[PDB]
């Protein structure tokens, strides 16, 4: 029984991913987000262990939802006649990283470092669980403003992680790597690193570096804000034009710019309260 169990509040957002609403779980008042996707729009499907045929996104979310992490967890789901309904966690209070950067401008490096580290941890988690997100971007990161914790949202463009080439992509073009732009081909991890490159520049400069395909394939990174040499170096490495010249996640997390990261609590205290 879906409507007896959740109390539906206001629409939080809508778009390519469908329509997401605020909610409270009637039993114990847990805040939730309720996401509706129309069956006619899911072109990628999987099978649960439980026989039943679900949208890939449900598969992906159950793979990454066990235990704690920086991924918004799937708490429950339902099939309706023309849609699927996904019950997700909702942090309170929350703001997404896109609105946060619009409001605050380029972030101080200490803050960019804490945020970026937490995203790295969350993306490593997805890969450990066999899941490739494929739409890493500020708009897909929620900030718990009290705990200082970042959470990944929206696996609807995701895929099972593989080591062979991907030749399909429905994520965000301005975060897509140049081998996708020119050849309609990419490998998972290395495309993931490129999009993290775009995300890191976004954070330290106040907006993404590239809007057009020619800029993406140009691989010229101009800095519009004062950014430290070490940080510019990490960004440029993540945005290397050849995939194999990009850093591994290990290499990113061992980069000198990534040393002495703040704890989430510290980050909330210094930068968010």
């Amino acid at each position: 029984p879906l409507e007896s169990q959740y109390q539906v509040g206001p629409l939080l957002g809508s778009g390519g991913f469908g329509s997401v609403y605020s909610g409270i779980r009637v039993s114990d008042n847990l805040p939730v987000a309720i996401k509706h996707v129309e069956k006619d729009r899911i072109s990628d499907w999987g099978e649960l262990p439980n026989g039943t045929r679900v949208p890939m996104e449900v598969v992906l979310l159950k793979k990454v939802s066990s235990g704690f992490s920086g991924v918004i967890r799937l708490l429950d789901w339902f099939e309706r006649p023309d849609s699927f309904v996904l019950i997700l966690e909702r942090p309170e209070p929350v703001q997404d990283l896109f609105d946060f950067i619009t409001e605050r401008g380029a972030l101080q490096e200490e803050l960019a470092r804490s945020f970026f580290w937490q995203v790295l941890e969350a993306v490593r988690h997805c890969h450990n669980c066999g899941v490739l997100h494929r739409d890493i971007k500020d708009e897909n990161i929620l900030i718990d403003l009290n705990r200082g914790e970042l959470k990944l949202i929206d696996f609807g463009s995701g895929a099972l992680l593989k080591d062979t080439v991907y030749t399909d992509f429905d994520g965000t073009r301005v975060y897509s790597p140049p081998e996708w732009i020119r050849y309609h081909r990419y490998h998972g991890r290395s495309a993931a690193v490129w999009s993290l490159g775009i995300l890191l520049y976004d954070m330290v400069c106040g907006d993404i570096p590239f809007e057009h395909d020619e800029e993406i394939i140009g691989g010229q990174v101009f800095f519009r804000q004062r950014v430290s040499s070490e940080c510019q170096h990490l960004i440029r490495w993540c945005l290397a034009l050849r995939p194999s010249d990009r850093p591994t996640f290990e290499e990113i997390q061992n980069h000198p710019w990534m040393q002495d990261v703040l704890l989430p609590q510290e980050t909330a205290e210094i930068h968010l309260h």
């Binding site: 778009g15 390519g16 896109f98 619009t102 965000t172 301005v174 975060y175 106040g206």
Partner: peptide, 7 residues
């Protein structure tokens, strides 16, 4: 000039 970009 700053904006969201859909999937």
């Amino acid at each position: 000039k700053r904006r969201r970009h859909p999937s």
